[model samples]
Target: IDLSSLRDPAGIFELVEVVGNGTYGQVYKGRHVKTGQLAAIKVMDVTEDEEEEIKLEINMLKKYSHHRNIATYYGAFIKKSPPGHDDQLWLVMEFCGAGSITDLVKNTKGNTLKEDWIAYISREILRGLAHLHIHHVIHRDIKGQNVLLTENAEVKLVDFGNTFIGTPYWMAPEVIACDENPDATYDYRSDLWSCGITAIEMAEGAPPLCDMHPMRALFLIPRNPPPRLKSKKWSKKFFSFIEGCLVKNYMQRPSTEQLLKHPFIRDQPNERQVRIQLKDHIDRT
Candidate 1:
């Protein structure tokens, strides 16, 4: 990484308030001094050992964050700190005032989202994944917390799950690299499985196996049948969509292109209304 390419954030952007917490750091609501544009600033303490890994993430964001369903990357900045303290790395991105899909589900009635709402949001996620798949970049993580919405109801994906830590509920069967499958690799389709889990999260307020301990869930995912909604009231098409995403065999799982064409995703009848509904909900909350 070119250290000289990084800028001092002092005169450029100002942090306002912490809007959310990530697995590795805090995200602040920030503003650009010149244009007064709002940005989501991800702040993480930098260490010598992780600089290379952070640089890889920065380069990936810069290269792949141009699609509509992926959050736009603004710039990277370095905040100096005193000796013995780790300097903070600030990652600025397009601000989504509506927060994340997880928040939306938690705040909604019955702890579940409307069917149309799920369709629209899931389509947006698939579109974003499609872009990455074409470029041979795997998201490695797809969950409600990583999918966010803007005030305009635009859905975008944030934070790549490249490292292993945090919850295991969203892990694809093939992704849990146990001693039995020490050679397991994250194929692009692995994200499709997580995407299905995220759909379950939106429809039911939590992913399948939410009640299980993380370690227990990890053990069960590969051996158990692919998860299904506890309630059978959802539409057949919705169930089919989930089936398409959660194929246990990665080799047989539908590609993003195939899933994008699924009726539930491809045939959205109330998209315009749903966007307005999402916007209104954001406003009220």
Candidate 2:
């Protein structure tokens, strides 16, 4: 899509259903009138910080939406209203019918995903992260909620919003600001940490501090030791992959490239079977 040529949202997409709202505004599931293609159209008022914030996401998507595991950007538009009203920013993106990984886990039996399912999803997540990291764009947020699955059971990363804030449960120790490190910093490795936490979420249906309050989890994230998977039922390779991701210090953490080579992600003996399992699950859901 041409970023310069802004199409009229009203002419291009017909609002199908409300998806949800975010820091920006209400998001809706929309359909392209001519192509009959479905898309998620996030409708929001102009940014408080002016258009810079909006351009950050729009331009980033313009540059980095090529990877299959990353959400594909269709286009962006300005939804105009009456002369006295504020115009809205409309971001059009690919629609994932199966919702998110969080949705999948919640709807699954016993609130747990099968190990093979986790393997497949995690591999897709890594693939997405690898693409972003290679191009020097840090995802900054990698959580079950941000990972979406298509009706075809294809997992892709989404919600790459502005502000750089992330869910505490999936946040890395190095990214959090503390008294000891008031000027906390982050790099691509921070995303690897979140990937580990997300893998844990897929396996256990929740992150490490699911029971804790958000502020408390924020307090504990940087102070506490690295997180681990709860159940021993997981394979050693899987455990190793998680360990590689959750290294407390970003400096010591394995790169996305390194984690991609891990047995848990690399050794996919049942890719076909897992896709079938996921497709069946998607069908039931």
Candidate 3:
């Protein structure tokens, strides 16, 4: 059978379930046609005008997914449409069965991960971010929902939607500033800001501005002092780590390289135990 004659992505696969859906298209739980291995399939409809951007996402996944902390891309295929219809691009990637960190925190008893769990997860996220940064690509989005976990508690970053369009709560002040100051630019440090906000979410079940409407928080993030973990339960080292990421000025912020050596992230001698603990938690859930 010719691939062009096939109606969907190349090869036969059963879509066991619908994982995600939106304006773009759908993400389905796909099983390999022959091997029966599970995977996530992201389907995007593309026209000539939007094809380049679609290709960019596929390219980024191909290049970046080599790391353990990034979702692995197995393959990509395009199905040509009939007549006036747009083509469909299918991206096959690893399926994190444990789901996103957002799901983890939400499912937790107190809606917060334990300190050690947060440390372990944050370190993995930094490793992914560092890989992306050294390769000259900023994640631009580093929220809890975009950070996923495997059943073994392995972390993988996903969801590169667009630079201009991102979740407001996790966005750095410098990025929003770019709207007002066309000359003001954002870089990897913006990701650090979002990283700090993510840590806060793990600790408190929400970001600093969760109390405020998103539009208002956008106004305040740049003008107000950098946020701190509101609760007093965290240790000094953890507080210091969050402070390092929440540095208000991108210019003054520490690089991922520098922050990787922070006491909370640097002292990982017990990381193996942390992984076991995380796995146990996942299993219990």
Candidate 4:
């Protein structure tokens, strides 16, 4: 908790390249200067007040990040700045060298993943969510970009509750405040809706209403029916799984434990093969 007491990260890990942009700031592909070990280093600029907020998140990361499906937190370092400059914080975590699920979907032949691949990945995500929800933490953000794959085809959830805003396309209806629901408040089930959207993203190229401007889509999400996979090519069980997660009234939404039992997630006959396929894909790219 004493972030100020940590050693300067400069001599330890060197930022190699800008890997991606996170909800709060930039993420870098970094390497340990001594052993050449890789890590995902998330860099966020913080003023004093924001520093206090970051401490809480850092504490949560330390406590809840040990699960197999959740990224492992290595350590954190404070990059002190001279007066008049905002200080930066570096959060070190296990590196998922294979990149994000979004990268996988885009790089696939048809901008879609195989049904089995989606099944395998989705279950891993649900497992991660179950771990967090049990600990009374809501992910608040679950999308293709936030779900990453390791070199060995392991799926892990990253970028936990640094901030509460959900990406508009994947935002659950209840997460958006509206006339009937005056105040926007959500429980862990909100992440289940985002999980359903991420499944659609893996099946197709993008989430439903992705064509609309993000702000417009935010307005439509509450009023519109729960989005569905556009094509009818998906299996009945797959459709059922998506429906289960996209239940309009979150009060009626299935819990993570319940959804984990859904056929699409429960029964994976080709799990081994799908993992091999994912590994091959990662190796190729």
Q: Which of 1 and 4 is ahead in TM-score? A: 4
Tell me the whole-model lDDT of each prediction, alpha carbons only: 0.90, 0.83, 0.83, 0.90
Which sections of candidate 3 miss by over 4 Å? 1-10, 20-25, 161-164, 178-180
List, residue by residue over 1-285, the lDDT tens digit for candidate 4.
777677789889999988865533588998999999999898888787786778887888899999999989999988989999888889999999998999999889989889999999999999999999999999988999999999989999986774444469998999899888988897899999999999999999899888898889999999999888888989999999999999999999999999999999999999999999899999997
Error of 1 at 137 (Å): 0.6
**Could you tell which candidate, 2 or 3, scores higher by TM-score?**
2
| lDDT digits (tens) for residues 1-285 of candidate 3 | 112332465566667887743422388888998898889888777777776566677778888889999989987777787879888777889988887887888888889888988888899989999999999888888988889888978999986533344447888888876456566576889889999999999999988888887788878888888888877988998999999999887888999999899999988777899899878878975
Q: Cα miss at 185, model 4 (Å)? A: 0.8
- The residue-by-residue lDDT of candidate 1 on 1-285, one tens digit each, is 564589899989999988865432588999999999899999888877878888878888898999999999998998978888788899999998898999999889889999999999999999999999998889987999889999889999997643647788998999777777788789999999999999999998999998998889989998899999888899999999999999998999999999999999999989999999999999986
Clashes of 2: 0
Ten-residue region with minimum lDDT total, candidate 4 = 158-167
lDDT of 2 at 32: 94
Model 2, 29-145: lDDT tens digits are: 899999998998888787445566677778888789878998789889987668676778888888988888988988897888888788789889989988988888888878887
Candidate with maximal lDDT: 4
Model 1, global lDDT: 0.90
Residue 172 error, candidate 2, Å: 0.3
